[PDB]
Amino acid sequence: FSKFVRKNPKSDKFKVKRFHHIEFWCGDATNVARRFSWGLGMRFSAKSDLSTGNMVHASYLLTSGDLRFLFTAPYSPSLTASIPSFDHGSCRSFFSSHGLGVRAVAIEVEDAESAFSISVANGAIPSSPPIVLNEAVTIAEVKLYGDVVLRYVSYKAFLPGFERVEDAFPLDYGIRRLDHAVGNVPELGPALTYVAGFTGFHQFAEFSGLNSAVLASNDEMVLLPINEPVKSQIQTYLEHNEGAGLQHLALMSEDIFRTLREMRKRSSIGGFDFMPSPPPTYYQNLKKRVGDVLSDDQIKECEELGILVDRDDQGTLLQIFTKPLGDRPTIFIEIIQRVGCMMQSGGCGGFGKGNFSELFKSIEEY
Amino acid sequence: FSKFVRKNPKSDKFKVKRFHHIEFWCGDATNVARRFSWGLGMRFSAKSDLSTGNMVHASYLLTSGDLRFLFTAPYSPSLTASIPSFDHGSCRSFFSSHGLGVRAVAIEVEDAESAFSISVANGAIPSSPPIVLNEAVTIAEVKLYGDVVLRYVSYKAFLPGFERVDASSFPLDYGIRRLDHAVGNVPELGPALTYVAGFTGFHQFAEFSGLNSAVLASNDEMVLLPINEPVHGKSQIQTYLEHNEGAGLQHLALMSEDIFRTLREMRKRSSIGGFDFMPSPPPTYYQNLKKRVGDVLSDDQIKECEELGILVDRDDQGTLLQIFTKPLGDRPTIFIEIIQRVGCMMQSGGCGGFGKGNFSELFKSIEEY
Ligand SMILES: CS(=O)(=O)c1ccc(C(O)=C2C(=O)CCCC2=O)c([N+](=O)[O-])c1
Numbered sequence: 001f002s003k004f005v006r007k008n009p010k011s012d013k014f015k016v017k018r019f020h021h022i023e024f025w026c027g028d029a030t031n032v033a034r035r036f037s038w039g040l041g042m043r044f045s046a047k048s049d050l051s052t053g054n055m056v057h058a059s060y061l062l063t064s065g066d067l068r069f070l071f072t073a074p075y076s077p078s079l080t081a082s083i084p085s086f087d088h089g090s091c092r093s094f095f096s097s098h099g100l101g102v103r104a105v106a107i108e109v110e111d112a113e114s115a116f117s118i119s120v121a122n123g124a125i126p127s128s129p130p131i132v133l134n135e136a137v138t139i140a141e142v143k144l145y146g147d148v149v150l151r152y153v154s155y156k157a158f159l160p161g162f163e164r165v166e167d168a169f170p171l172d173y174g175i176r177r178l179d180h181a182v183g184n185v186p187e188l189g190p191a192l193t194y195v196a197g198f199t200g201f202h203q204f205a206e207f208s209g210l211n212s213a214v215l216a217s218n219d220e221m222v223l224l225p226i227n228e229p230v231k232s233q234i235q236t237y238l239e240h241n242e243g244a245g246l247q248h249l250a251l252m253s254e255d256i257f258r259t260l261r262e263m264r265k266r267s268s269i270g271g272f273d274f275m276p277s278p279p280p281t282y283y284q285n286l287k288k289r290v291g292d293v294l295s296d297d298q299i300k301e302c303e304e305l306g307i308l309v310d311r312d313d314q315g316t317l318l319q320i321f322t323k324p325l326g327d328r329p330t331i332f333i334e335i336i337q338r339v340g341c342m343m344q345s346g347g348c349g350g351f352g353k354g355n356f357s358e359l360f361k362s363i364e365e366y
Numbered sequence: 367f368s369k370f371v372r373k374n375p376k377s378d379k380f381k382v383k384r385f386h387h388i389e390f391w392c393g394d395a396t397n398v399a400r401r402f403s404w405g406l407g408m409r410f411s412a413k414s415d416l417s418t419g420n421m422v423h424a425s426y427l428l429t430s431g432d433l434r435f436l437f438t439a440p441y442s443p444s445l446t447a448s449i450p451s452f453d454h455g456s457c458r459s460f461f462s463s464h465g466l467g468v469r470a471v472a473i474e475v476e477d478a479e480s481a482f483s484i485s486v487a488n489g490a491i492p493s494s495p496p497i498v499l500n501e502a503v504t505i506a507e508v509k510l511y512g513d514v515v516l517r518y519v520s521y522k523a524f525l526p527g528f529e530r531v532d533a534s535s536f537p538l539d540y541g542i543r544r545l546d547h548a549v550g551n552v553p554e555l556g557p558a559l560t561y562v563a564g565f566t567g568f569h570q571f572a573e574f575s576g577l578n579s580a581v582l583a584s585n586d587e588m589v590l591l592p593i594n595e596p597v598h599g600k601s602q603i604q605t606y607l608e609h610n611e612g613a614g615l616q617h618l619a620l621m622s623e624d625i626f627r628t629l630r631e632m633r634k635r636s637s638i639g640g641f642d643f644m645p646s647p648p649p650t651y652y653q654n655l656k657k658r659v660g661d662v663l664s665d666d667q668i669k670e671c672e673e674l675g676i677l678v679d680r681d682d683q684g685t686l687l688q689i690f691t692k693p694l695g696d697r698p699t700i701f702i703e704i705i706q707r708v709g710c711m712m713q714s715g716g717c718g719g720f721g722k723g724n725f726s727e728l729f730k731s732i733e734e735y
Pocket residue numbers: 180182212213225226227248308321334351352353355356359
């Protein structure tokens with residue numbers, strides 16, 4: 001009776017691959033990284049600070065699976081830098097106006113020199129030219145939205161100037177990669193026009209107080225949703241963050257029950273807090289909608305963990321959200337596990353849009 | 367046939383009680399407060415942030431016994447505040463230029479209204495005049511060294527504005543009970559002691575590498591404030607001074623009712639968010655312990671020091687267990703000291719000293735072969 005048809009022109013203007021890393025910018029990178037390390041279960045595995053010769057910034061790298069979080073903070077200008085786009089004047093201005101937040105959204109491409117030239121010839125505002133690192137890595141950044149940039153990394157074979165680390169049954173709760181990354185802007189329209197203009201990402205098709213549109217690369221493994229405000233928590237983000245900027249990171253986990261039992265045990269001891277949980281009638285209503293996909297016990301396991309379930313035409317998406325990460329109510333994190341389109345299709349299950357109404361309906365029915 | 371003689375003129379110019387709290391100025395206090403809380407074993411007790419109506423700064427207060435560690439970072443000017451000494455321009459420049467560190471070292475007093483008037487009269491530079499909060503508490507701040515301020519907290523009989531924190535069954539506790547002392551790094555010791563002692567009346571508490579130290583003390587000798595200058599000809603005092611961009615607080619000793627229970631808990635967490643300690647002394651260091659502190663510790667308590675990297679020193683009055691963490695933030699500046707003092711029971715302040723005999727004991731032990 002029902003059918004949902006999707007288009008994919010594959011209009012990528014240059015060839016991209018995968019999410020590479022995210023770069024948090026902060027004031028003291030050691031504590032943000034040691035916090036996030038115990039909350040998310042990410043192994044400290046590369047660094048570039050004083051003990052490595054870097055007298056410009058302290059950059060630490062947390063890895064879990066392929067997911068790579070880089071934490072960067074400036075030292076005193078009175079004092080070698082491995083990241084060629086770093087600057088005290090821009091980093092101090094970033095953190096003053098926005099607080100703890102994502103500075104770069106980084107994606108592996110075939111060639112960063114071309115990826116940047118084609119971008120800038122297609123409307124992209126440049127933020128950092130192509131710089132070859134030790135004849136091994138190329139790095140370039142164009143403005144994405146607000147003071148967030150889209151960062152192109154390319155190889156010929158973490159980064160030059162980084163040392164390795166391995167010592168900590170090390171930290172691993174099941175997080176395996178970055179699924180999608182989300183910004184908020186004032187006016188979605190011009191933002192979609194800009195971004196899709198210089199990348200050729202096609203709009204992804206989905207099944208209160210925001211309007212959402214999702215860009216995807218040719219393989220739809222580089223997903224970028226964007227939200228505009230229609231009270232509206234999108235509007236609250238823009239005020240506290242002082243402009244456009246990134247809203248959440250969704251982390252793909254190989255077992256969302258493993259990940260969640262770990263991250264809820266640590267909420268009150270340095271880890272991360274979560275949204276208050278749906279009413280029990282939300283989970284009583286699961287069997288009627290996804291009981292062909294989740295066994296009763298896994299349904300039990302979602303109620304026991306506050307885990308949201310939605311599905312669209314292809315598969316089913318399990319998701320739960322944290323509270324804000326630092327001071328301001330701005331950046332939160334989303335933990336997701338996608339089930340269904342096994343080949344795994346990018347975006348299997350969508351992004352959770354269905355849960356707004358399905359959560360309202362569960363509230364009303366006791 | 368030796369005796370160490372201590373004088374105590376008890377020259378306090380006002381009446382001071384104990385250490386009250388330490389305030390770290392941050393950029394994002396949530397991750398620092400949470401890092402410290404898991405790392406030291408201190409409970410979340412109060413807040414003053416957006417959730418409670420404060421829209422100028424976020425402050426999260428961690429306690430553990432009597433130790434009170436307050437964490438404050440500024441919001442955006444575009445947005446209620448419970449600490450009348452705060453400033454966005456002051457907190458930005460404090461964090462741009464010194465990194466994460468101590469802003470204020472706060473002491474309880476009979477009257478902060480009078481502690482300030484006397485201090486300013488004897489040289490001390492005023493930083494925040496006395497301000498009564500909800501007609502219940504009074505707060506004032508005079509410049510200590512660099513951008514540290516000495517802060518006076520007097521009661522009529524955590525603070526006004528703070529919402530008390532929620533429960534998690536048996537919250538964190540590794541044994542830390544109070545702030546023993548709060549050490550400073552100055553370029554010149556002389557002008558340091560003259561200025562501080564000139565306005566506090568605190569007296570030189572006598573002691574039994576590349577630095578010179580003098581310990582300043584109130585009439586009960588329970589508020590302790592050692593001060594350090596560098597000796598040139600390398601010096602960690604001088605290395606502090608460059609990364610900190612001037613004078614500032616160098617370390618906090620955290621008294622613990624069982625240093626082993628604290629170092630067992632803390633060392634378990636070093637690589638899962640916690641704190642890291644300096645490399646442990648050679649094993650000859652501890653073979654030497656029997657003959658200098660065997661009359662105070664057992665054979666099993668000298669083993670527990672080795673299995674833990676703990677250092678032992680003693681005075682004419684008592685013995686001093688101590689261990690040191692690596693620098694708590696990005697910059698190589700402020701660190702934390704975990705100590706527990708044995709003896710001087712009536713417990714006195716400055717039982718066992720401050721560890722100054724451990725420079726040569728460590729160096730002596732290092733000559734293994
Ligand atoms: C109302 S809810 O089910 O809790 C809920 C459900 C889904 C999301 C989701 O992350 C967002 C997507 O990434 C991109 C499109 C908009 C959107 O909604 C959120 N959200 O993070 O705002 C909340």
